C-alpha cells in the first residue's frame, strides 16, 4: 500500500491499522492525521491508552508500539503530523513541522527548524528544541510542560478564550497570568484552585482577549497582551511590549525597551536602569496615552500621532522641569539629573505634540 501526494498541500487521514503503509507527500506542505479514525475495539483492548510513536526524522510512524512492530507507516516529505486521541510520542525532523498531539497525554519534540507544537487536550510534554518554535495552548485546566529549547520561542494562549462555552475557569477576571521569570503560567483560575503550566526557555508570550498579566524574565522578551486591559512587565533585558486593544499598562523595567500601547488609553513606562545606557521607545499609538518618567530613567523618546490629549507624568516637581528644543524634538529634562524625556518631532506639527504634564 503506497500513497504519493501531489505538488500542493495534501492531507492524509491515516488509521491505526496493523498493515505497513508507504506515504510520500511530495512537494508542498503535507500533513498526516491520526485523530480522525476511530481506534478499533481490539486495539483499545490490547493497546490501552498508548497511541502512536512517530519520528519524522526516522521516517516511521509506529501505530501499534511494542505489540506489533510490523504496523509502521513509512513517511517522507511530510512536514506536519497530527496524533491520535491517545498518548502519543511524536518527534519532528530538522524542517519546520506542525506537530499536534490532540487528546491524550503526548510527548512532542520538534527537533530543528521553526516548529509549531500544539499539545491539545491532555497532560502534554512539549520540547521545541533548536529553532524559533511556537507553542499553541488550549482551553483546559490540565497542566502542560513546555521547554522552548534554544532559539526565540513563543507560547500562545489565544485559544484560552473562544466563542462558545469556555471549560477552564477565569474567575479572577484574567485570561492568563504568565511569569517567565518564575517559569510558570497560570492558565486558569477559580475560587481556591489554580492551574499552571511549566514554561521554560520560552522568550515570548501571546495573551488572550481578556485581561492578562504578562511578566518577562532577564532575556529579551516579546509580550503581546492582545485584547482586554493588560498588565505587562518586561523585566531585565531589551524587551518588546505590545498592549494591543484595550487600556493597557506596559512597563519595560531595566534595559532598552520598546513599548507599543496600541489602540486604547494606555500607560507606558520605559523604566530605569538597574546598573546611562537606558533608552526606551514609547509609542502609545492611538488614544489618550500616559507616559511615565522619573529620576534614573535615562533618555526615553515618545512617538505620538493624532494630536490628542496625551499626558506625561513625571515624578518630579514642576519647578524641577526644564524644556529645550532639540532639532524638531521637545526635550524635557529634570534639573540636577542627566535624565531627559524626548517627544519626537514635537515641533514639526501638532499631531506629534504632547501638551499635558502631571508633576509631583
Amino acid at each position, epitope marked *: 500500500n503506497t500513497v504519493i501526494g501531489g505538488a500542493g498541500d495534501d492531507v492524509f487521514l491515516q488509521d491505526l491499522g496493523v498493515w505497513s503503509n508507504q506515504l510520500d507527500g511530495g512537494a508542498g506542505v503535507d500533513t498526516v492525521k491520526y485523530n480522525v479514525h476511530q481506534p478499533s475495539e481490539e486495539r483499545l483492548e490490547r493497546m490501552g491508552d498508548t497511541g502512536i510513536h512517530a519520528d519524522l526524522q526516522k521516517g516511521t510512524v509506529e501505530k501499534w508500539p511494542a505489540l506489533n512492530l510490523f504496523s509502521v507507516d513509512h513517511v517522507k516529505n511530510i512536514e506536519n503530523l497530527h496524533g491520535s486521541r491517545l498518548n502519543d510520542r511524536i518527534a519532528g525532523d530538522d524542517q519546520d513541522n506542525e506537530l499536534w498531539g490532540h487528546d491524550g497525554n503526548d510527548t512532542i519534540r520538534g527537533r530543528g527548524g521553526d516548529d509549531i507544537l500544539r499539545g491539545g487536550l491532555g497532560l502534554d510534554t512539549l520540547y521545541g528544541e533548536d529553532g524559533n518554535d511556537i507553542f499553541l495552548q488550549d482551553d483546559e485546566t490540565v*497542566s502542560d510542560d513546555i521547554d522552548g529549547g534554544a532559539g526565540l520561542d513563543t507560547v500562545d494562549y489565544s485559544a484560552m478564550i473562544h466563542p462558545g462555552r469556555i471549560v477552564a475557569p477565569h474567575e*479572577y477576571g*484574567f485570561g492568563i*497570568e504568565a*511569569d517567565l*521569570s*518564575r*517559569e*510558570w503560567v*497560570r492558565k486558569a483560575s477559580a475560587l*481556591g484552585v489554580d492551574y*499552571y503550566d*511549566n514554561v*521554560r*526557555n520560552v522568550e515570548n508570550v501571546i495573551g488572550t482577549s481578556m485581561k492578562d*498579566v504578562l*511578566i518577562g*524574565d*532577564a532575556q529579551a522578551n516579546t509580550l503581546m497582551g492582545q485584547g482586554g486591559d493588560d*498588565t505587562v*512587565r518586561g523585566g531585565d533585558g531589551d524587551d518588546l511590549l505590545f498592549g494591543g486593544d484595550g487600556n493597557d499598562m506596559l512597563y519595560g523595567d531595566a534595559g532598552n525597551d520598546t513599548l507599543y500601547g496600541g489602540l486604547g488609553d494606555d500607560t507606558l513606562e520605559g523604566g530605569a536602569g538597574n546598573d546611562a545606557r537606558e533608552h526606551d521607545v514609547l509609542r502609545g499609538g492611538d488614544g489618550v496615552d500616559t507616559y511615565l518618567f522619573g529620576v534614573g530613567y535615562g533618555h526615553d523618546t515618545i512617538y505620538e500621532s493624532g494630536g490628542g490629549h496625551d499626558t506625561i507624568r513625571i515624578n518630579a516637581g514642576a519647578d524641577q522641569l526644564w524644556f529645550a528644543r532639540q532639532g524638531n524634538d521637545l526635550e524635557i529634562r529634570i534639573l540636577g539629573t542627566d535624565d531627559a524625556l524626548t517627544v519626537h518631532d514635537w515641533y514639526r506639527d501638532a499631531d506629534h505634540r504632547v501638551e499635558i504634564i502631571h508633576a509631583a
Partner: antibody
Amino acid sequence: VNLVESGGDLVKPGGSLKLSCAASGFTFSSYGMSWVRQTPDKRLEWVATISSGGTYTYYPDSVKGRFTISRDNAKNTLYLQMSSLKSEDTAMYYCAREIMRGGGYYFDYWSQGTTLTVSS
Amino acid sequence: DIQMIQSTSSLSASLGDRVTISCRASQDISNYLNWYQQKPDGTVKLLIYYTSRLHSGVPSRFSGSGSGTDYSLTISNLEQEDIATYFCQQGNTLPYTFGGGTKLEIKR
C-alpha cells in the same frame, strides 16, 4: 500545604551551612519558592527566590555572592547553601511558597523558623 | 530600595475594638501590598495580599485598604487570638521589603 524547614546550627564566622525545606501537599514544581529570615530585632528580610524550574535565582544585595538557593523537584526539597557567613546572618530562617497575582508577589504559606547562630 | 515604614511599632487595644495598622512605602507600589501575621510562637501566616484580597481561611473581620504609598490593615472586632505582630510587605519590585512590624497586645 506543608513546608518543613531544617538545618539550623551554630557556625563560626566565615563558615558554611545548608538548610533544607521539605514540601508536601501541592505540586512543588509549579511554584517559585523563597527563603525569608528574621533577625533578633524581629525585622523580616527576603533572602532568596528560585524559579519553579530552577533556571533563575534572585537575591538581595545583602546576600548576593554568598547564598545559593536550589531545589530538587524530584525530591520536593528546597535548599539554601550559605557561605562566608557573618554575625549579621544570625537569624531565624523561614522557607515560604511564592505566589504572583495581578503583577505582584507574595508568600502564601510559610514553614516554621530554623535558627542560624554565627559566633566564634 | 523601597522602604516600608509602619509608624507604630507597638499598640494596645481592647477586645471588640476596631484596630487599624498603617503602612507607608517610599514609592508607589501599585497596590502590591501584603500583610502577614506572626503569632507569639513565631509562626507566620498570610492575611491579605494585593492591598485588600483576603487569603483563604482568614476571618472576615480582617480588611485592607490603600493605594499609592499609604496602606492600612483593619481589624473590625479585636479578638483575643489576634495578639500578634503584623508586618506589611510590598511585592512590586526586588527586593521585596517588609515593614518593621507592629506588635499588637490586648488592653486588659
